[PDB]
Write a structure and sequence with these properties.
It is a single chain. The protein is of the alpha/beta class and 1390 residues long. Helices cover 63% and strands 7% of the residues. The protein is globular, with a radius of gyration of 40 Å. The N and C termini lie far apart (114 Å). It is classed as membrane protein.
Length: 1390
């Protein structure tokens, strides 16, 4: 009688069954009875809380357990007749059941797992008794007690199912908990171990996503150990531990030590997966040996059992299931660790950036820090996926090669030489891949920069009508983009072909061709099929070895950047004391101590410092610091803000701070959100402020309500709008201490006169409280209650204007309530507002599943190319299957003829077959990429650019610039690469699945009945996952960008936010943002895990069906060992193929939806500007004119006539249709009721291009394009360089071209024109206008962006240069109003 784990029959013997049951019962009864009972009694004190319904299901489970224990006690008597170790198993099961009878009662996990092990043990014992009954008498072969052991088995199954499945209902008011119905709690908090591995909760979420499109409400709240606060504190404790033993690697040690446990668990699970994976080749080998030995046995019987095969099939199924469960648990743990890393690091970087020093901001550009927050944290999050894999790879390689050495033999390591010699080729190809990716990213960023540059001021581009050089340059860049993308496609296709071909075919065709005969031993079909499976498993380590090393190298750069960023210089707490509020009026509000001294230097003691200056401001006054550029005005103001390191002096600031910098700051949120800057609403005070500072016309001009979108991700706003918004925000922030740095600079001067009296002067709203307004305006100096002349960081004199006037006035003159404070907001919760705006566009369709869009893309490609691609894919798959089946035939021949190989002949045949399949895949991936794909990028981009270039001003003013900027740039890139990859992957995996199922059907006829239900299940899960993951990916893409945009904006307004002391609100907003992003990502990865689990379970069921049907065919009749080996070997490739193909399906769907969106952007039309059938010595006239958008009205009842050679000055009060006259004259809007006549010709009949080409505009703006000055002034090569030189000389800008442009007339320009002053840009626009030879000229806004000399120069230039050209000037200057021959008055509406 045997006693090992395997008997002569394949089943466990009785001894090993008792041993494993004893082990399971021992570990259960010790670990549950210690840990769970002690913890429950300690926490709950034997269950203080009696909350339980005591439903009948629990009593039924208890009674089932009791009757099972009774049956066990009854069967204990009979089995003890033999003298064996079964009494130990009986006693252990008795004690375990007796403990469980109380354990079930006490809880109202470990219990469930123990019941599963007990059920498996009873099932194994029953199978043993049935097998002995097959080998012996009918029923009572072993003993008569198996009939009640069946009752024990069914009782175990029933109690396991009835404990695992149903919930624990509670009677007394369970509904009271769910008060907050904004989001359901996640089911993950309430999920036992049986359901958690199966992810049934995600199946419920999948159903809810199937029946409804997901929104904020449908998603669940995150569970604990995911919010910002706990993760940030847990990282800060490890950061203090770094501060104990500070050094550069301390950041890495703190990060790893705070989350290393989950990575260790992931490592253990990966080890379990790796050791389990190679068992299946061994089971394949022993199955092949068993079937061929059984055929030999039957032949010997004819010359002179099935239980092994069935149990081997069951072993294969169990191996597949355990592999599935442990692998997906590993993936879940690793991605959870990455989520923790991202959530901690983003919050910590935000806090450190918020408390960062101003000098540190000066030493660190905004691009570097925002790129650090975007890429480096994402780099760590991505590297968390592959971090354990660097350890997993060598172990898998070592155990695979050990198994190969045991199987094949000694000194047969040609595969090792192929691996090690091919690895440097992989390294070189990965290097070229990285270089191509970096160059492509640089080119994409450059093209996006050019597009943003033109789109910032494309209104002026439309007016000048220089579109042809723009699109020509874009196509010129597109040529380089096309060739670089072609090179990337060629390299990627070569990499794909080498990865497909190099490992399996070449390594096999070397090793089993050579070393089988070189060792003098027949193949006999046991070697090559396990060898082929081993090579297929070993393919992944070859690519995995160099891949993770690149990101591992990048991790050093990322962690070094993070470490220097963290340990960069902070600022001291003691720069200034923000004391309590101001007392009753008279004492002090602000004080800088005696001989105070400050600087922008603490460590090295740079020269940037001021020394020995004091300051004092009385309560309720207006002060003004007056000084030139570099005077130390900004230094003194920032010192008052406390943003400096003091070296000497006493700084006390009373009350609260309100501050406006010279550069206005605007948040991404709406104008309502900006003006209501985290404060409770107050309607009358809001109306008072908006009346006093701004105007209601300033709200009306926005073409939207108060909830309009700010120009950062909305409609662009002019500088005066920004200044008025900043002043409105400041005055709405009712505060004690007030600070303004030239807010009137970026607005009209006569409107600045309205500003000073209404809000600042003694009638002003904030009259009785201290305010500093630093400006060099004479009206401000006259009205101000104190003046401080400052220069070079040292005050010269201070006092009242009375004190100034007494001595020589040279050095400045010749050169009972306190408004009840403000009131902050309550720090509320905030959703992601971007969802509804795109939901408006998505509302058109809800069943977008028809493939008309796919056939449209097919028409947009060459369909013959698609047919050739399909045929090439099928040819490659057929060649591979032919190679495998011919290998089966050759191995069967070698099995029949004992050691009589046609070795060279079949070596040549197999080499030809494999290299033919590899070349077919090569020609598929290389050439047809070039034909269909870049044709698509070229054509889709040409149509999109052609449509969007000719778009109307209604589209430009309505749609945001940023919205079409991101979609035009990003989505064109996604269709270029990702779509072309994913279509190929989808078709390859589809054809692979079809051929695998076809050969399996060829193995046995009756497989269609088993494959049909599994195919239905597969289609069901694919539909559910697609309709969920589409919306989840959309939400994830939505929530990513607002975090980085908010980081950029709060960095830009660092001074203003730190002055306003709203640091808590911004921190809470960042925490809410990352919480929303985590909520919009965790269901996505868990949905991926759920789908991959169920698909791999389907693959394991396919393995079981193939094996058991093969054994059934074996029992039914003759069966070849090679056919079974081939069928099982092809069956083993199912799981990875299905798990990839569904994901590629949803990716193709997402890419096609993006293609439809950008095509919808391309779905636009406008008027035809082309020539279809004109200056000087001609009259001009307008009659009955009307031209505005349909939703508004400005122009009506206008009849005017202008003779040639007359100058016109237009005058109008604010809002009286000023710019509409210019746009009507240019005929920018196609709507034209009436007739405008020039040269006795109606303007609308001809077109737009020639008319715009034959006029001159000064658009009130001076920002121009980047690039060469000659290209900017004269993009089309009109006439020479001497002409523009003369125009520049007449415009009097010789100084700039003399200073710069040393190489020639080719000086470069920074984009946006900020490198040079606005007056010089105005001179450049003047020079361009004078270069334009047209008589019609439009001039606008001469009285709001000039410094007197510019106005005189342009007035004399338009006077003397255009002696007779018709000039219409729209301005407020008295001189140009008087000098005009005919003053046209701009009526309010007609």
């Amino acid at each position: 009688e045997g006693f090992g784990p395997i008997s002569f029959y394949g089943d466990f013997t009785q001894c090993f069954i008792d041993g494993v049951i004893l082990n399971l019962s021992a570990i259960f009864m010790i670990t549950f009875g210690i840990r769970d009972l002690v913890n429950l009694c300690k926490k709950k004190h034997s269950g203080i809380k009696y909350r339980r319904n005591w439903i009948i299901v629990s009593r039924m489970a208890l009674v089932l357990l009791e009757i099972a224990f009774v049956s066990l006690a009854s069967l204990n008597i009979s089995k003890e007749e033999a003298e064996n170790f079964t009494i130990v198993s009986q006693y252990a099961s008795t004690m375990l059941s007796l403990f469980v009878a109380l354990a079930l009662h006490w809880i109202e996990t470990v219990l469930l797992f123990y019941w599963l092990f007990e059920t498996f043990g009873n099932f194994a014992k029953l199978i043993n008794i049935l097998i002995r009954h097959t080998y012996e008498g009918i029923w009572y072969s072993g003993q008569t007690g198996f009939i009640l052991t069946l009752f024990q088995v069914i009782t175990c199954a029933s109690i396991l199912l009835l404990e695992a499945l149903p919930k624990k209902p509670l009677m007394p008011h369970q509904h009271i908990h769910q008060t907050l119905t904004r989001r359901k709690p996640n089911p993950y908090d309430s999920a036992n171990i049986f359901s958690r591995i199966t992810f049934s909760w995600m199946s419920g979420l999948m159903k809810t996503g199937y029946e409804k499109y997901l929104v904020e409400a449908d998603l669940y709240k995150l569970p604990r150990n995911f919010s910002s606060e706990e993760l940030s504190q847990k990282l800060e404790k490890n950061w203090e531990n770094e501060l104990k033993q500070k050094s550069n690697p301390s950041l890495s040690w703190a990060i790893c030590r705070t989350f290393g446990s989950k990575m260790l668990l992931a490592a253990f699970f990966k080890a379990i997966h790796d050791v389990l994976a190679f068992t299946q080749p061994q089971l394949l080998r022993i199955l092949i040996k068993f079937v061929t030995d059984y055929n030999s046995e039957r032949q010997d019987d004819h010359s002179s059992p099935i239980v092994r095969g069935f149990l081997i099939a069951f072993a294969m199924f169990l191996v597949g299931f355990t592999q599935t469960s442990v692998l997906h648990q590993y993936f879940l743990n690793v991605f959870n660790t990455g989520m923790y890393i991202k959530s901690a690091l983003t919050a910590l970087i935000y806090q450190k950036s918020l408390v960062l020093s101003n000098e540190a901001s000066g030493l660190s550009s905004t691009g570097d820090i925002v790129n650090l927050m975007s890429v480096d944290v994402q780099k760590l999050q991505d590297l968390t996926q592959w971090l354990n894999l660097i350890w997993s790879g060598p172990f898998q390689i070592i155990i695979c090669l050990y198994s190969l050495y045991k199987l094949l033999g000694n000194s047969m390591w040609v595969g090792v030489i192929i691996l090690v010699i091919m690895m440097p080729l992989n390294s070189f190809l990965m290097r070229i891949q990285k270089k191509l990716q970096k160059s492509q990213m640089k080119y994409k960023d450059e093209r996006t920069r050019v597009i943003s540059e033109i789109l910032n001021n494309i209104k002026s581009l439309k007016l000048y009508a220089w579109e042809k050089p723009y699109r020509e340059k874009l196509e010129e860049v597109r040529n380089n983009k096309e060739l670089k993308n072609l090179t990337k496609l060629g390299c990627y296709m070569a990499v794909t072909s080498f990865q497909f071909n190099i490992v399996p075919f070449l390594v096999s065709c070397c090793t089993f061709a050579v070393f089988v005969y070189t060792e003098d031993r027949a193949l006999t079909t046991d070697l090559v099929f396990p060898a082929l499976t081993l090579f297929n498993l070993l393919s992944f380590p070859l690519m995995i070895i160099p891949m993770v090393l690149n990101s591992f190298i990048e991790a050093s750069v990322s962690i070094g950047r993070l470490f220097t960023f963290f340990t960069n210089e902070e600022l001291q707490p003691d720069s200034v004391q923000r004391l309590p509020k101001v007392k009753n009026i008279g004492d002090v509000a602000i004080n800088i101590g005696d001989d105070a001294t400050f600087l922008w230097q603490r460590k090295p003691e740079y020269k940037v410092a001021l020394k020995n200056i004091n300051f004092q401001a009385k309560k309720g006054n207006l002060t003004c610091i007056v000084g030139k550029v570099g005077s130390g005005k900004t230094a003194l103001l920032s010192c008052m803000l406390g943003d400096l390191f003091r070296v000497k002096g006493f700084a006390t600031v009373h009350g609260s701070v309100a501050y406006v910098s010279q550069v206005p700051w605007i948040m991404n949120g709406t104008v309502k959100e900006n003006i209501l800057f985290g404060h409770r609403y107050d309607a009358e005070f809001y109306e008072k402020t908006i009346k006093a500072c701004a105007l209601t016309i300033d709200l009306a001009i926005l073409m939207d309500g108060d909830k309009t979108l700010v120009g950062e991700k909305g409609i662009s706003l002019s500088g005066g709008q920004k200044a008025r918004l900043s002043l409105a925000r400041a005055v709405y922030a009712r505060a004690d201490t007030y600070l303004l740095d030239d807010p009137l600079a970026a607005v009209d001067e006569h409107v600045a006169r309205h500003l000073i009296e209404h809000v600042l002067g003694p009638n002003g709203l904030l009259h009785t409280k201290t305010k500093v307004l630093a400006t060099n305006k004479v009206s401000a100096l006259s009205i101000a209650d104190s003046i401080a002349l400052l220069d070079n960081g040292e005050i010269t004199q201070q006092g009242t204007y009375d004190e100034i006037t007494k001595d020589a006035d040279s050095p400045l003159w010749k050169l009972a309530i306190s408004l009840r404070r403000a009131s902050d907001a309550t720090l509320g919760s905030i959703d992601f507002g971007d969802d509804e705006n795109i939901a408006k566009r998505e509302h058109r369709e809800q069943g977008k599943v028809k493939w008309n869009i796919y056939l449209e893309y097919a028409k947009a490609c060459n369909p013959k190319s698609v047919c050739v691609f399909i045929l090439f894919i099928v040819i490659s798959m057929f060649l591979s299957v032919m190679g495998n089946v011919w290998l089966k035939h050759w191995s069967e021949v070698n099995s029949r003829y004992g050691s009589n190989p046609n070795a060279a002949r079949y070596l040549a045949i197999y080499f030809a077959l494999g290299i033919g399949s590899a070349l077919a895949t090569l020609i598929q991936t290389i050439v047809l990429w070039v034909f269909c794909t870049i044709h698509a990028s070229k054509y889709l981009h040409n149509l999109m650019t052609n449509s969007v270039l000719r778009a109307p001003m209604t589209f430009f003013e309505t749609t945001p610039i940023g919205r079409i900027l991101n979609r035009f740039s990003n989505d064109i890139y996604k269709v270029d690469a990702l779509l072309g990859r994913t279509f190929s992957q989808f078709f390859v995996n589809a054809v692979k699945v079809t051929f695998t199922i076809t050969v399996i059907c060829a193995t046995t006829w009756q497989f269609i009945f088993i494959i049909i239900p599994l195919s239905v299940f597969y289609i069901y899960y694919q539909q559910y996952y697609l309709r969920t993951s589409r919306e989840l990916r959309r939400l994830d893409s939505i929530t990513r960008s607002p975090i980085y945009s908010h980081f950029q904006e709060t960095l830009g307004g660092l001074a203003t936010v730190r002055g306003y002391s709203q640091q808590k609100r911004f921190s809470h907003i960042n925490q809410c943002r990352i919480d929303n992003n985590m909520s919009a990502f965790y269901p996505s990865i868990n949905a991926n895990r759920w789908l991959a689990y169920r698909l791999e379970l389907i693959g394991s069921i396919i393995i079981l069906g193939a094996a058991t049907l093969s054994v059934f065919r074996l029992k039914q009749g003759t069966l070849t060992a090679g056919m079974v080996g081939l069928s099982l070997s092809y069956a083993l490739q199912i799981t990875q193929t299905l798990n990839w193909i569904v994901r590629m399906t949803v990716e193709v769907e997402t890419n096609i939806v993006s293609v439809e969106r950008i095509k919808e952007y391309a779905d636009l039309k406008s008027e035809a500007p082309l020539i279809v059938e004109s200056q000087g010595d001609i009259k001009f006239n307008n009659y009955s004119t009307r031209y505005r958008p349909e939703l508004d009205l400005v122009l009506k009842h206008i009849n005017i006539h202008i003779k040639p050679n007359e100058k016109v000055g237009i005058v109008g009060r604010t809002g009286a249709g000023k710019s509409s006259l210019t746009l009507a004259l240019f005929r920018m809007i196609e709507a034209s009721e009436g007739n405008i006549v020039i040269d006795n010709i109606a303007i609308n009949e001809i077109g737009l291009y020639d008319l715009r080409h034959k006029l001159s505009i000064i658009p009130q703006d001076s920002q121009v394009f980047e690039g060469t000055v000659r290209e900017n002034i004269d993009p089309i090569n009109q006439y020479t360089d001497e002409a523009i030189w003369r125009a520049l000389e007449l415009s009097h800008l010789k100084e700039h071209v003399l200073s710069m442009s040393n190489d020639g007339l080719d000086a470069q320009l920074t984009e946006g024109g900020g490198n040079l002053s606005v007056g010089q840009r105005q001179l450049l626009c003047l020079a361009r206008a004078m270069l334009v030879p047209s008589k019609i000229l439009v001039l606008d806004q001469a009285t709001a962006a000039v410094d007197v000399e510019t106005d005189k120069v342009v007035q004399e230039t338009i006077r003397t240069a255009f002696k007779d050209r018709t000039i219409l000037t729209i301005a407020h200057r008295l001189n140009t109003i008087m000098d005009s021959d005919r003053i046209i008055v701009l009526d309010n509406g007609k």
